[PDB]
RNA sequence: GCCAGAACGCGACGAUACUACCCGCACGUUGUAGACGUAUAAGAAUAGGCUCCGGCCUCGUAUCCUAGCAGGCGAUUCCUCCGCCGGCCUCGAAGUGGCCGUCGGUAAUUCGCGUAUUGCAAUUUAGACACGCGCGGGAUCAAAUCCUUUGCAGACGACUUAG
RNA sequence: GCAUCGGUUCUGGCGGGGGGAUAAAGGCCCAGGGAAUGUGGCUCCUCCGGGAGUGUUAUAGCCCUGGGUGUAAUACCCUCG
């Protein structure tokens, strides 16, 4: 079973531009601007409408043609990062043990860097390096919060996940041990 | 004045002898012929004479330079190679020379 | 089919067993060829498939003695590709040592075999034989994990001599507005009838 | 918000698009069989560009600019003959390159040696007068 | 291989207590009539009381299609052998003519289940007069309204005994 | 059938093949990476071996049983005289890895350096670099002046070429050593500039080292005849009662 | 990092007596895995490119060169193309090309003399790489081994030294 | 080496004949009956390309049955040169 055609649309609000080039996006707006390559699926872009971009695979498998969608969600957050931004929020949980973290300014150059202490009561200083373009701060507005603030949603979740699986408890029923650092929820800059 | 070349012939190869996959027979040799694809227009040479000539390290005659005749018998496979018989086997050294090819016989 | 006195194919995009056949028949035939930038060649499959046939292929040796007799694991992507091509001839006979005489392979353009024209083969093209969506690697990358040590120079060399050619090829351009002009100019004001003439004849 | 995207356009496949076989033959689609087979026929008065009807396989053919407006799906050798000469098809199709780079091609395979030792001359002739122009300006660059 | 349907009359030798025996038909798709007479044999041995020694041909012919220029529908019902048991199906193809429809399912049936000629047996064969009465989904979606598709990334042709070429082709015819 | 004990195999196959080194002198096989931010400076001594003395001093490591107390230590004593330079080489990066293209000498030669190019010096000519040394004075050195530009033109690295003064030594050998120490440093202009200024002249071994610094040792040991394998690779004896 | 270094893998430098070396042409005993127009330099993408910004792309089935005793002797004509040298710039992955100048040759058009007899076919003995020789010009006037000795070395050779 | 012949054999082209539903299709003409992936009209929405509904040839056309042009041509098999 081979499909013929499957087409789906993008619409592009009044505020941003957007070009492709041999299968590379350039998306630039109020916020900054992005890159991605996506020379490695075939699909073929079209303009439908004054603001709606199509794109569509010819031919292709069932296998083929779920890869479509993909590209059409990671263009629709990219669309939607460089308008509105990303935020994510994290939260401290200890038991008995506080722990204390660092997150000095920037180090000569654009990442940021975090320093976490007294984990568990350990004396071990680890050391994490943000992706560029990301933003951490700690939050004024009440007590326990991290705040991750950026324009790409790939390298805040990364960041995030970096921050997530550093802190880990070994040779530990983890279960009873439930000390780590968590994300607990997801959204934009504005509103 | 007249820098032209001087070419009455088309130059072909000499590919091998005609063989199974273990057992060779000298009676008959194989030519590459230049331009053939097909054996459409490998027709065209059926009949025609070809020359193998080479090098030797005496005078004799006048000359130092020695010839072998021959002419094309059928064509063979479907890719223009051709089928040859010489007055006598070639030298079993000249897996990949190149010999001469006539315009004798005509139509 | 054509005899030249030499031939030089520029390795970038050639399937290695599919280029090498037809190396070998052309060297068996009596043609003689030069490969060039060995290192942009390609093989089909995902990486690691690659990466685990050559440990496979590292595994073998000489138990009684390694120095001699043994399976010599060569490391260069040029290397590779030789050895692709002794599989295909009898090399134990004077006949395949003087087929492999007429052979000559390198990494990159060298200085002999630039300024020279460079032929393409069309039977072993990978954009006209994979399908769309399935995976390959490099020769290059390969011999980098597995320890080729001259990838940087070499590469940091090509540029060099890719901004010369980008000079010549301004000179060309150059070059080609007057002949064009001069066409245009020259058949208009004198020829009454060749122009015509040439035009039946088809040129 | 004006977007440009500079993406590859193929040309499309339906009914009234001109095909070109190998041998010099133009045949109009009149129905979809699958995707690697069609229904075609061209009727034209020329003997060298008619052709019968039947299915052609889809690899064996070319996709001609040339393409019929209007024309029903399945429709008989005479409706497709009364709009292959209402369109003109046959004189739109002598003015484009792929027809006269061919009929220059076949021109040159019926040359008499006498006539190839004339254009020899001849194209040393417009030769002369060409290097005379090229050093003219290339003396005053 | 490459097939025509035919029509073949058989008939039990005529004796004298039971004169004047009936007479059956069936439609055979065959190479040739020499093989069109066996498999008429072996499909009577499996529904009467009649062998080839017993019994006797009184026509074979060849029916021709009666429009094979005009596309239709075609609709399949067979038995085969799988590696244990046997199976019904029913399938549907698209052409222009019936015995095409019956070279395609045996090429179909060989790749898809591994299926040979030996243990294929064709129920009935009937074109589908209608539109609304096919049922598989790989063919509604020939049918659709101002049908058309691009052909992108076809190789162009070139001569196997030229060998370098001297530029690099491109896929855009 | 399998082996009863286990135990590691005897010596070590990383050093395997134990041979004779090809050449008398140590040979040095690397140097330090090169890195353009500090100034110029060599890298490489060459000295001889006197001999062997013990020394007392008191120790400076927190935690330590001995802390704050008086150890006795071994040393090694090594004669250093200065060294002269008498010329300098530059090398260049191909694909098939590093290659020398031009090499330049100083005007004058000691006999000891020129001691070392000849096997028979008592009844040679001793003409070495007569002809060499001609080309200076001759349109004020206009072609080694050519040959330094290529080196600042076309090298990646240099090295400088030096030898022993043998002759303030209680040696009886006469014949110097020579080899070469690369310069590692800002750029190739200010390396060739400062090798090419040290054109014989002497420096001495406080210039290149210091005190309290960690550095490597090459050297060919000492040599035995011919031993077996009790000794070569230290394999258990066969009880008293062996024949043969 | 470290150990050995292909005894048929490679580079730089020093001194080279015996025409050992270099330059010019004069023939040719002699060798070759095999000339006979041995003519063609962008890079990059293949679900896109090239450009003279007007347009162009399935196709190298292309472009350049291609006449005259194996290519003579003169004339009317024409300022094109080819070759050897000399001088300035440039080229290092295994170092190449450009410009200028002198000199020699030269159907783009049209003519005048000579070709025979090799006898109705018999390779069209013609190219460039080395190497051996003969001349006439330039430069140059060396080492190694045996031997005695040393012990940082050693079965004997070999190795580190001195004469 | 060439011209004219004999035996064996490979490989091209041309002129005819017979058979089947006396091929089946197909072109033109006559007579009858239908439908939609509904032509032209009409209605509504969308101006943003167009879409939705009604309805059997009109400013496109398609399917089924019978007859003439027919002893039509062509494909396949066989056959005389
Ligand atoms: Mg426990
Ligand atoms: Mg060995
Ligand atoms: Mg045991
Ligand atoms: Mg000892
Ligand atoms: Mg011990
Ligand atoms: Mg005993
Ligand atoms: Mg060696
Ligand atoms: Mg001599
Ligand atoms: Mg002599
Ligand atoms: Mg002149
Ligand atoms: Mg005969
Ligand atoms: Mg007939
Ligand atoms: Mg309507
Ligand atoms: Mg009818
Ligand atoms: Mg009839
Ligand atoms: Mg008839």
Redesign the interface.
């Known amino acids: 079973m081979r499909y013929i055609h499957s087409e789906e649309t993008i619409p592009v609000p009044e505020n941003l531009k957007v070009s492709i080039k041999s299968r590379l996006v350039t998306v630039e707006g109020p916020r900054g601007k992005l890159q991605k390559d996506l020379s490695h699926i075939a699909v073929n872009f079209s303009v439908v409408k004054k603001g709606v971009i199509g794109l569509e695979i010819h031919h292709g498998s069932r296998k083929d043609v779920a890869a479509l969608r993909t590209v059409r969600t990671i263009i629709n957050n990219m669309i939607i990062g460089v308008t509105k931004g990303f935020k994510y929020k994290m939260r401290y949980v200890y038991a008995h043990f506080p722990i204390n973290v660092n997150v000095e300014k920037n180090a000569e150059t654009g990442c940021y860097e975090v320093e976490i202490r007294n984990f568990i009561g350990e004396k071990i200083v680890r050391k994490v390096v943000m992706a560029p373009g990301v933003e951490v701060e700690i939050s004024k507005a009440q007590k326990d919060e991290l705040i991750l603030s950026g324009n790409s949603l790939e390298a805040v979740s990364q960041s995030a996940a970096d921050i997530q699986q550093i802190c880990k408890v070994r040779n530990k029923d983890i279960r009873k041990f439930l000390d780590g650092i968590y994300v607990s929820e997801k959204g934009n800059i504005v509103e | 004045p007249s820098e032209a070349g001087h070419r009455l012939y088309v130059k072909g190869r000499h590919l091998s002898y005609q063989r199974g996959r273990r057992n060779t027979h000298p009676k008959t040799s194989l030519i590459k012929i230049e331009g053939v694809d097909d054996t459409a227009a490998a027709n065209f040479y059926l009949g025609k004479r070809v020359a193998y000539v080479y090098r030797a390290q005496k005078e004799v005659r006048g000359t130092k330079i020695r010839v072998i005749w021959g002419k094309i018998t059928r064509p063979h496979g479907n890719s223009g190679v051709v089928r040859a018989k010489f007055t006598h086997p070639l030298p079993a050294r000249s897996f990949g020379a190149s010999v001469r090819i006539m315009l004798y016989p005509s139509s | ?3 030249e006195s030499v ?1 030089v ?1 520029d390795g970038k995009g050639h399937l290695l067993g599919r280029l090498a056949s ?1 190396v070998a028949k ?1 060297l ?3 043609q003689k060829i030069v490969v060039v930038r060995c290192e942009a060649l390609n093989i089909s499959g995902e990486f690691f498939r690659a990466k685990l046939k050559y440990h496979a292929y590292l595994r073998k040796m000489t138990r009684y003695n390694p120095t001699r007799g043994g399976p010599f694991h060569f490391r260069a992507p040029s290397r590779i590709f030789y050895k692709a091509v002794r599989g295909m001839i009898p090399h134990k006979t004077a ?1 395949g040592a003087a ?1 492999l005489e007429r052979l000559k392979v390198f ?2 353009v060298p200085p002999p075999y630039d300024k020279k024209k460079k ?5 072993a ?1 990978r ?2 034989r994979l399908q ?2 399935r995976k390959y690697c490099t020769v290059g990358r390969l011999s980098h994990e597995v320890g080729w040590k ?1 990838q940087d ?2 590469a940091r ?1 090509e540029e060099r001599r890719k901004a010369k050619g980008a000079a010549y090829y301004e000179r060309k351009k150059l070059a080609a507005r ?2 064009s ?3 245009k ?3 208009a004001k ?2 009454p009838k ?1 122009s015509e ?2 035009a039946a ?3 | 918000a004006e977007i440009n995207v500079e993406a590859t356009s193929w040309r499309r496949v339906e009914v009234g698009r001109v095909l070109k076989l190998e041998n010099g033959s133009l045949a109009a689609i009149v129905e979809i069989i699958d995707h690697k087979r069609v229904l075609a026929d061209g009727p034209s008065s020329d003997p060298k560009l008619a052709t019968p009807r039947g299915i052609v396989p889809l690899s064996r053919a070319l996709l001609t600019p040339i393409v019929i407006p209007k024309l029903p799906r399945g429709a008989r050798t005479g409706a497709v003959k009364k709009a292959w000469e209402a369109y003109g098809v046959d004189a739109k199709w002598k003015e484009t390159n792929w027809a006269k780079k061919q009929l220059q091609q076949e021109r040159r395979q019926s040359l008499t040696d006498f006539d190839r030792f004339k254009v020899m001359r001849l194209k040393k002739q417009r030769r002369f007068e060409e290097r005379k122009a090229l050093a003219k300006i290339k003396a005053a660059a | 291989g490459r097939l025509q349907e035919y029509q073949v009359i058989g008939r039990h030798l005529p004796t004298e207590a039971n004169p004047n025996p009936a007479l059956y038909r069936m439609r055979i798709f065959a190479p040739n009539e020499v093989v069109a007479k066996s498999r008429f044999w072996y499909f009577l041995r499996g529904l009467k009381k009649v062998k080839k020694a017993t019994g006797e041909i009184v026509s074979v012919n060849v029916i021709s299609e009666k429009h094979p220029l005009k596309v239709k529908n075609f609709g399949i019902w067979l038995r085969y052998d799988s590696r244990s048991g046997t199976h019904n199906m029913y399938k549907e193809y698209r052409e222009t003519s019936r015995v095409a429809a019956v070279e395609a399912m045996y090429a179909d049936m060989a790749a898809r289940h591994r299926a040979r000629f030996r243990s294929i047996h064709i129920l009935k064969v009937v074109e589908l007069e209608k539109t609304e009465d096919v049922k598989r989904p790989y063919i509604k979606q020939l049918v659709a309204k101002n049908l058309s598709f691009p052909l992108p990334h076809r190789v162009p042709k070139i001569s196997t005994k030229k060998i370098f070429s001297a530029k690099r082709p491109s896929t855009f015819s | 059938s399998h082996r009863k004990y286990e135990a590691p195999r005897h010596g070590s196959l990383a050093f395997l093949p134990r041979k004779r080194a090809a050449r008398h002198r140590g040979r040095v096989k690397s140097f330090p990476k090169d890195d353009p931010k500090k100034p110029v400076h060599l890298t490489a001594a060459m000295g001889y071996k006197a001999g062997m003395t013990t020394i007392v001093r008191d120790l400076d490591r927190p935690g330590a049983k001995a802390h704050k107390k008086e150890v006795v230590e071994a040393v090694t004593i090594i004669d250093c005289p200065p060294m002269v330079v008498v010329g300098l080489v530059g090398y260049i990066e191909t694909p098939r890895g590093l290659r020398s293209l031009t090499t330049v000498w100083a005007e004058h030669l000691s006999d000891e350096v020129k001691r070392r190019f000849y096997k028979n010096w008592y009844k040679s000519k001793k003409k070495a670099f007569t002809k060499y040394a001609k080309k200076y004075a001759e349109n004020n050195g206009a072609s080694i002046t050519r040959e330094l530009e290529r080196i600042k033109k076309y090298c990646t690295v240099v090295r400088v070429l030096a030898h022993t003064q043998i002759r303030k030594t209680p040696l009886k050998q006469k014949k110097a050593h020579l080899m070469e120490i690369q310069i590692n440093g800002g750029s190739v202009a200010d390396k060739v500039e400062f090798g090419r200024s040290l054109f014989e002249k002497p420096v001495t071994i406080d210039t290149i080292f210091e005190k309290d610094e960690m550095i490597d040792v090459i050297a060919v040991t000492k040599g035995h005849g011919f031993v077996g394998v009790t000794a070569r690779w230290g394999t258990k004896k066969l009880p008293r009662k062996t024949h043969k």
């Open positions: 089919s054509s005899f031939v194919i037809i052309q068996l035939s009596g006949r087929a990494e990159g032929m393409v083969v069309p039977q093209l954009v006209l769309p969506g001259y120079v070499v060399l007057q002949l002009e001069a066409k100019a020259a058949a004198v020829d060749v003439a040439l004849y088809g040129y």
